């Protein structure tokens, strides 16, 4: 089988900025197609027969390629171009896709709008509870999140949910949740969300 | 020859007579002169068109659209023009002709249909059939008689005149036969046999030939295009399967027959002693 | 325009079978080849097999991964595609897409919603939705203790669709957990209907809640 190893696993690009991903093939090839998939959406055909742009596709995009080396390039990066891009080969059997190149808009920063919600009584009924902090619209992605048992860094029972780049404003969002028991509400009193980023000198704590 | 011989009528001003495809009849009497009455001929007047078939089409304006596999149903744009006959087909395809996938590609072939020779079929009835009836006196002259206006008064001058009522029955089953015209020869086709022929046909003053494929060969496909021809003359193979019909002459928008006869009342009354 | 709506996704035990459907509309089905592609929960993108049209003897071709296991069939009479599946296992776990094929040099142009295929022996479970009430203003609905994925949340019956932030869900205790938050002017609360629709295709249920 002919394997399509994609160059540029993930990458960021500032608006107006020219972008280029590579499709390396483990064997000669006739043509290469490219698909665009926006988070949630099912793929879309975009570049076919190496360089012919699908319909609806902005003239900004373009594809070159011959033999084993192919690439597509966005002339001037833009927010609507934010997605994963896959290359397909046709010259041989079976049909092959690449792993995909994630394309992120490198925009301006934003304050992690931290929030929290007390354990909804519903589960406090049979010994069920866990505090959950929330961290919406914020850039860049990089962010350390922490809880504390009255000064005690707690890591046992903490799993997070890193979401993708919102399409309407290119921002992110995260969610963290502490867990061991529920019989532990009166068993302790100080809870914390010590979120640290680069859009604040002092690590945000809204808890 | 078939010059029959009668006698006025028992002290009356009339006679009832009958004629064949040729026969004439002399009518004698004491006082009034003798009158040779002949049925000269009968013809069909102004025949109207009912359906003309083609027997030598012309094919022009070729144009075959195509599509690989995975490119759906090839559609020829001319398929929107009535003058064109189109036959969607299928053909081998592959790399060798700009397709990345060997398989049956769609194809649509179009060609204009034109007619070069029509076999015009015509019809007749009572409102158009004439009957030549010559009349002599011992001076003469002829005339025609229709089922519409059967009678007729002939002024004979110093001899007098004569009314001639009539009943123009014939032999042919009117509204059961048609007047076919292949080439120059004209024939008499039998009702259905006519509108049962497999050929392209116009209708009543129509410009729309139907059942056209009959005369054009869609030849072996060919990735690029597809050859289409028109079949040779049918005149030949139309005369061959059309000799049992009645050979006739369509001389000048009229038709000579034979199966006819008149029963006429001859009002000799008006005749001078 | 074109319509490619998959159907027949659910949870099945390691070895079972399933027949996936792709009801199409907005075009002449028979005329076009057709294909199935699956996307694993890992982004990777696997072609499975395609099936020609009538005039091509319904020619089919399958990937090494599907030899024997599955076979694809075409209901040309109703514009329907099927992918009969047998003896599933860990790898077959994915989201299965149904696309038409097109172009001189074939490419999958119009894909479809996709449909979710989970393979495991664990048990179905109706989630535990709770009221994430504000202790402007930001609310939401917590959704824990459920299996298998996916769940579906909405607000105001699909109406309210701006400021909505329904996060991803992570595995733990053989369980999925997803959260959700949305925001409106602190002036229109609680002066308007605050409801979070939450459907669970696994146990075929819903819970029209309301965060008072």
Q: Taking a C-beta distance cutoff of 8 angstroms, is the pair A173, A138 a contact? A: yes
With tokens 């509400």, the residue in question is: A185
Order of strands, sheet of B16-18, starting from the edge strand that comes earlier in the sequence:
B16-18, B263-267, B161-165, B154-155
Neighbouring CB atoms inside 10 A of C64's CB total: 7
Q: Which of B58, B25, B53, B54 is nearest to B39 (CA)?
A: B25
For B93, which residue in chain C has the nearest alpha carbon?
Answer: C104
C59 neighbourhood in chain B, CB within 8 Å: 103
Q: Are strands A113-117 and A159-160 parallel, antiparallel or unpaired?
A: unpaired
Residue B214 in tokens: 């009959």
Mutate to test the interface with B, among C34, C56, C57, C61 (most CBs of B within 10 A): C56
**Cα(B26)–Cα(B7) distance, integer angstroms:** 8
In chain A, beta strands by DSSP E:
4-7, 10-13, 19-25, 32-37, 44-48, 52-53, 61-66, 69-74, 83-89, 96-97, 101-105, 113-117, 132-136, 159-160, 173-177
Phi, psi (degrees; rounded to nearest 5) at B96:
-55, -5
Q: Taking a C-beta distance cutoff of 8 angstroms, is the pair B100, C106 a contact? A: yes
For A92, which residue in chain B has the nearest alpha carbon?
Answer: B100
Q: Which H, E and C letters describe chain B, residue by residue?
A: CCEEEEECCCCCCCCEEECCCCCEEEEECCCCCCEEEEEEEEEEECCEEEEEEECCEEEEEEEEEEECCCCCCCCCHHHHCCCEEEEEEEEEECHHHCCCCCEEEEEEEEEEEEECCEEEEEECCHHHEEEEEEECCCCCCCCCCCCCCCCCCEECHHHEEEEEECCCCECCCCCCEEEEECCCCEEEEEHHHHCCCCCCECCCCCCCCECCHHHEEECCCCCCCCCEEECCCCHHHHHCCCCCCCCECCCCCEEECCCECCEEEEEHHHECC
Residue C28 in tokens: 């002449």
Contact with chain C for residue A173, Cβ under 8 A: yes
Are C63 and A94 within 8 A, CB to CB?
yes
Q: Which of B34, B27, B33, B24 is nearest to B3 (CA)?
A: B24
Q: Taking a C-beta distance cutoff of 8 angstroms, is the pair A37, A55 a contact? A: no
Contact with chain A for residue C173, Cβ under 8 A: no
**Cα(B169)–Cα(B129) distance, integer angstroms:** 10
**Cα(A58)–Cα(A41) distance, integer angstroms:** 18
Q: Å from B115 to nearest chain A CA?
A: 45
**Identity of the residue in B70, B98, B104 whose CB atom sits nearest the CB atom of C106:** B70
**Cα(A172)–Cα(A61) distance, integer angstroms:** 25
C103 neighbourhood in chain B, CB within 8 Å: 70-71
Same CATH fold assignment for domains C1-121 and C122-212: yes
What technique solved it?
X-ray
* Last residue before each break in chain B (C–N > 2.5 Å): 138
Contact with chain C for residue B68, Cβ under 8 A: yes
Q: Å from C91 to nearest chain A CA?
A: 17
**What's the burial of B57, exposed, middle or buried (CB within 10 Å: 0-12/13-18/19+)?**
buried
Q: Å from A39 to nearest chain B CA?
A: 29
Per-residue CA distances from B175 to A180, B42, B124, B127, B198 (Å): 104, 17, 7, 12, 22
Are B101 and C105 within 8 A, CB to CB?
yes
Neighbouring CB atoms inside 10 A of B95's CB total: 10
**Which resolution, in Å, applies to this structure?**
3.0
Tell me chain B's radius of gyration from C-alpha atoms.
Answer: 30
Phi, psi (degrees; rounded to nearest 5) at B13:
-100, 35
**Cα(B69)–Cα(C35) distance, integer angstroms:** 14
- Greatest Cα pair distance, chain B, in angstroms, is 107
Contact with chain C for residue A156, Cβ under 8 A: no
Order of strands, sheet of A113-117, starting from the edge strand that comes earlier in the sequence:
A113-117, A132-136, A173-177, A159-160
With tokens 């319904």, the residue in question is: C58
Query: Which of the 8 DSSP states describes residue A196?
Result: B
With tokens 């919600």, the residue in question is: A117
Mutate to test the interface with C, among B68, B70, B221 (most CBs of C within 10 A): B70
Q: Å from A120 to nearest chain C CA?
A: 6
Are A48 and C107 within 8 A, CB to CB?
yes
Are C104 and B100 within 8 A, CB to CB?
yes
Residue B116 in tokens: 């070069």
Angle, vertex CA B79, rays to CA B234 and CA B62, nearest 5: 55
C43 neighbourhood in chain A, CB within 8 Å: 84, 99-100
Subunits adjacent to chain B (3 or more Cβ pairs under 8 Å) = A, C
Q: Taking a C-beta distance cutoff of 8 angstroms, is the pair B53, B197 a contact? A: yes
Subunits adjacent to chain A (3 or more Cβ pairs under 8 Å) = B, C
Find residue C199's DSSP bridge partners: C152, C206
**What's the burial of C33, exposed, middle or buried (CB within 10 Å: 0-12/13-18/19+)?**
buried
Phi, psi (degrees; rounded to nearest 5) at C205:
-135, 175
Cα torsion C45, C48, C51, C57: sign: positive
Question: Is the preceding peptide bond at C79 cis, omega within 30 degrees of 0?
Answer: no
* Nearby residues of B212 by Cβ (< 8 Å), 6 or more positions away: B57, B85, B113, B200
Find residue C196's DSSP bridge partners: C155
Q: Taking a C-beta distance cutoff of 8 angstroms, is the pair C205, C126 a contact? A: yes
Are C31 and B104 within 8 A, CB to CB?
no
Q: Å from A162 to nearest chain C CA?
A: 7
A88 SS3 class: strand
How many CA atoms does the CB half-sphere of C19 hold within 13 Å? 7
Neighbouring CB atoms inside 10 A of A136's CB total: 23
Segment 3-42 of chain C within 8 Å of chain A by CB: none
Per-residue CA distances from B59 to B54, B198, B227, B231, B232 (Å): 13, 18, 11, 10, 12
Q: Taking a C-beta distance cutoff of 8 angstroms, is the pair A50, A31 a contact? A: yes
**Cα(C22)–Cα(B106) distance, integer angstroms:** 25
B100 neighbourhood in chain A, CB within 8 Å: 30-31, 90-91
* Nearby residues of B27 by Cβ (< 8 Å), 6 or more positions away: B6, B7, B8, B15, B17, B34, B35, B37, B266, B268
Per-residue CA distances from B189 to A135, B21, B43 (Å): 95, 21, 17
Find residue B60's DSSP bridge partners: B112
Per-residue CA distances from B199 to B19, B184, B235 (Å): 41, 19, 12
**Cα(B225)–Cα(B64) distance, integer angstroms:** 5
Q: Which of A99, A107, A178, A101 is nearest to A141 (CA)?
A: A107
**Cα(A31)–Cα(C82) distance, integer angstroms:** 29
Residue B17 in tokens: 């007579």
Question: Is the preceding peptide bond at A94 cis, omega within 30 degrees of 0?
Answer: yes
Query: Domain A1-107 adopts which CATH fold?
Result: Immunoglobulin-like (2.60.40)
Distance from chain centroid for Cα A46: 21
Contact with chain A for residue C212, Cβ under 8 A: no
Q: Å from C24 to nearest chain B CA?
A: 16
- For chain A, where do the domains classified as CATH 2.60.40.10 start and end? 1-107, 108-207
Superfamily for the C122-212 domain: Immunoglobulins (2.60.40.10)
Contact with chain B for residue A185, Cβ under 8 A: no
A91 neighbourhood in chain B, CB within 8 Å: 100
Architecture category of domain C1-121 in CATH: Sandwich (2.60)
Contact with chain A for residue B98, Cβ under 8 A: no
Q: Taking a C-beta distance cutoff of 8 angstroms, is the pair C117, C97 a contact? A: no
Residue C138 in tokens: 């930001």
**Cα(C133)–Cα(B72) distance, integer angstroms:** 56
Q: Å from C44 to nearest chain A CA?
A: 6
Query: Which of the 8 DSSP states describes residue A140?
Result: S
Q: Which of C196, C205, C137, C126 is nearest to C161 (CA)?
A: C196
**Cα(B20)–Cα(B261) distance, integer angstroms:** 5
Find residue B25's DSSP bridge partners: B4, B37
Which chain C residues touch B if contact means CB-CB below 8 Å?
28, 31-33, 52-53, 55-56, 59, 101-106
**Cα(C130)–Cα(C81) distance, integer angstroms:** 40
Q: Which H, E and C letters describe chain C, residue by residue?
A: CCEEEEECCCEECCCCCEEEEEEEECCCHHHCCEEEEEECCCCCCEEEEEECCHHHCCCEEECCCCCCCEEEEEECCCCEEEEEECCCCCCCCEEEEEEEEECCCCEECCCCCCEEEEECCCCCECCEEEECCCCCCECCEEEEEEECCCCEEEECCCCCCCCCECCCECCECCEEEECCECECCCCCCCCCCCCEEEEECCCCEECCCCCC
Contact with chain A for residue C165, Cβ under 8 A: yes
How many interchain CB pairs under 8 A, A with C?
98
CATH of A108-207, one of 2.70.150.10, 1.10.3720.10, 1.10.340.70, 2.60.40.10: 2.60.40.10
Residue B244 in tokens: 């049992």
**Cα(A83)–Cα(A45) distance, integer angstroms:** 13
Break chain C into its structural domains and give their ranges: 1-121, 122-212
Per-residue CA distances from C152 to B33, B161, C107, C143 (Å): 118, 110, 32, 10
Q: Which of C128, C143, C130, C132 is nearest to C183 (CA)?
A: C132
Are C104 and B71 within 8 A, CB to CB?
yes
Are A120 and C131 within 8 A, CB to CB?
yes
Contact with chain C for residue A54, Cβ under 8 A: yes
Query: Which of the 8 DSSP states describes residue A42?
Result: -
Per-residue CA distances from B112 to B77, B120, B225, C155 (Å): 13, 22, 16, 62
* Nearby residues of B252 by Cβ (< 8 Å), 6 or more positions away: none
Q: Å from B100 to nearest chain C CA?
A: 5
Q: Which of C14, C11, C3 is nearest to C81 (CA)?
A: C3
Break chain B into its structural domains and give their ranges: 1-273
Q: Is B46 left (phi over 0), alpha (psi -120 to 50) or beta?
A: left
Neighbouring CB atoms inside 10 A of A54's CB total: 18
Q: Which of A135, A134, A132 is nearest to A199 (CA)?
A: A135
Q: Taking a C-beta distance cutoff of 8 angstroms, is the pair B257, B2 a contact? A: no
Cα torsion C189, C191, C192, C198: sign: positive
Are C56 and B90 within 8 A, CB to CB?
no
Q: Which of C85, C102, C103 is nearest to C94 (CA)?
A: C85
Angle, vertex CA A38, rays to CA B101 and CA C49, nearest 5: 30
Neighbouring CB atoms inside 10 A of C43's CB total: 12
Are A100 and C45 within 8 A, CB to CB?
yes
Q: Taking a C-beta distance cutoff of 8 angstroms, is the pair C144, C177 a contact? A: yes
With tokens 């002066």, the residue in question is: C191
**Cα(A86)–Cα(A36) distance, integer angstroms:** 7
Query: Which of the 8 DSSP states describes residue A156?
Result: T
**Cα(C141)–Cα(C181) distance, integer angstroms:** 7
A120 neighbourhood in chain C, CB within 8 Å: 130-133, 142
A50 SS3 class: coil
How many CA atoms does the CB half-sphere of B58 hold within 13 Å? 7
Angle, vertex CA C182, rays to CA C176 and CA C186, nearest 5: 145
Q: Å from C32 to nearest chain B CA?
A: 5
**What's the burial of B267, exposed, middle or buried (CB within 10 Å: 0-12/13-18/19+)?**
middle
For A161, which residue in chain C has the nearest alpha carbon?
Answer: C168
* Nearby residues of A25 by Cβ (< 8 Å), 6 or more positions away: A2, A3, A4, A5, A32, A68, A69, A70, A89
Mutate to test the interface with C, among A40, A113, A117 (most CBs of C within 10 A): A117
For C103, which residue in chain B has the nearest alpha carbon?
Answer: B71
């Amino acid at each position: 089988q002919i394997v399509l190893t994609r160059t540029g696993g993930i990458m960021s690009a500032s608006p107006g900025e020219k972008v280029t991903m590579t499709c390396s093939a483990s064997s000669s090839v006739s043509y290469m197609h490219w698909y665009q998939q926006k988070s949630g959406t099912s793929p879309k055909i975009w570049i076919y027969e190496s360089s012919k742009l699908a319909s609806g596709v902005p003239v900004r995009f373009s594809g070159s390629g011959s033999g084993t080396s192919y690439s597509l390039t966005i002339s001037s990066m833009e927010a609507e171009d934010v997605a994963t891009y896959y290359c397909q080969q046709w010259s041989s059997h079976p049909l092959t896709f690449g792993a995909g190149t994630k394309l992120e808009l490198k925009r301006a920063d934003a304050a992690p709008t931290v929030s929290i919600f007390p354990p909804s009584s519903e589960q406090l009924t049979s010994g069920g509870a866990s505090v959950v902090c929330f961290l919406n619209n914020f850039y860049p992605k990089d962010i350390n999140v922490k809880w504390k048992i009255d000064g005690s860094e707690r890591q046992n029972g903490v799993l997070n949910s890193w979401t993708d780049q919102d399409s309407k404003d290119s921002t992110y969002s995260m969610s963290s949740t502490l867990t061991l028991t529920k019989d532990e509400y009166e068993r302790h009193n100080s809870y914390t969300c010590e979120a640290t980023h680069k859009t604040s000198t002092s690590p945000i704590v809204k808890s | 020859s078939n010059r029959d011989f009668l006698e006025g009528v028992s002290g009356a001003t009339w006679v009832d007579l009958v004629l064949e495809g040729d026969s004439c009849v002399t009518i004698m009497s004491k006082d009034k002169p003798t009158i040779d009455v002949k049925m000269m001929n009968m013809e069909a007047a102004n025949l109207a068109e009912v359906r003309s078939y083609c027997y030598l089409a012309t094919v022009s304006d070729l144009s075959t659209k195509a599509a690989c596999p995975t490119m759906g149903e090839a559609h020829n744009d001319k398929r929107a023009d009535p003058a064109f006959v189109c036959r969607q087909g299928v053909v081998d395809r592959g790399w060798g002709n700009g397709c990345g996938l060997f398989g049956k590609g769609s194809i649509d072939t179009c060609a204009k249909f034109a007619c070069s020779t029509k076999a015009i079929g015509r019809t007749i009835l009572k409102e158009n059939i004439k009957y030549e009836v010559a009349i002599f006196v011992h001076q003469a002259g002829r005339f025609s008689i229709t089922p519409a206006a059967p009678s007729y008064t002939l002024k004979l001058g110093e001899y007098g005149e004569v009314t001639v009522d009539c009943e123009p029955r014939s032999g042919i089953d009117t509204n059961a036969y048609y007047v076919m015209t292949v080439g120059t020869k004209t024939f008499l086709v039998h009702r259905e046999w006519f509108m049962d022929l497999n050929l392209p046909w116009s209708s009543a003053g129509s410009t729309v030939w139907r059942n056209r494929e009959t005369l054009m060969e869609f030849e072996e496909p060919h990735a690029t295009k597809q050859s289409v021809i028109a079949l040779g003359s049918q005149e030949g193979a139309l005369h061959q399967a059309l000799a049992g019909a009645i050979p006739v002459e369509f001389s000048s928008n009229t038709v000579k027959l034979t199966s006819g006869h008149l029963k006429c009342r001859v009002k000799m009354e008006k005749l001078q002693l | 325009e074109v319509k490619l709506v998959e159907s027949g996704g659910g949870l099945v035990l390691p070895g079972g079978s399933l027949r996936l459907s792709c009801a199409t509309s907005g075009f002449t089905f028979t005329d076009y080849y057709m294909t199935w592609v699956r996307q694993p929960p890992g982004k990777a993108l696997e072609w499975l097999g395609f099936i020609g049209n009538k005039a091509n003897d319904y020619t089919t071709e399958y990937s090494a991964s599907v030899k024997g296991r599955f076979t694809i069939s075409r209901d040309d009479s109703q514009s329907i595609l099927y992918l009969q599946m047998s003896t599933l296992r860990a790898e077959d776990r994915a989201t299965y897409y149904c696309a038409t094929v097109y172009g001189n040099y074939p490419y999958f142009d119009v894909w479809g919603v996709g449909t979710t295929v989970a393979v495991s022996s664990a048990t179905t479970t109706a989630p535990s939705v709770y009221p994430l009430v504000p202790g402007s203003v930001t609310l939401g609905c917590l959704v824990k203790g459920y299996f298998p994925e996916p769940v579906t949340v909405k607000w105001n019956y699909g109406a309210l669709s701006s400021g909505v932030r329904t996060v991803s869900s992570v595995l733990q205790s053989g369980f999925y957990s997803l959260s959700s938050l949305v925001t409106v002017p602190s002036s229109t609360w609680p002066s308007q209907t605050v409801i979070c629709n939450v459907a669970h295709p696994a146990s075929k249920v819903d819970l029209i809640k309301e965060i008072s």
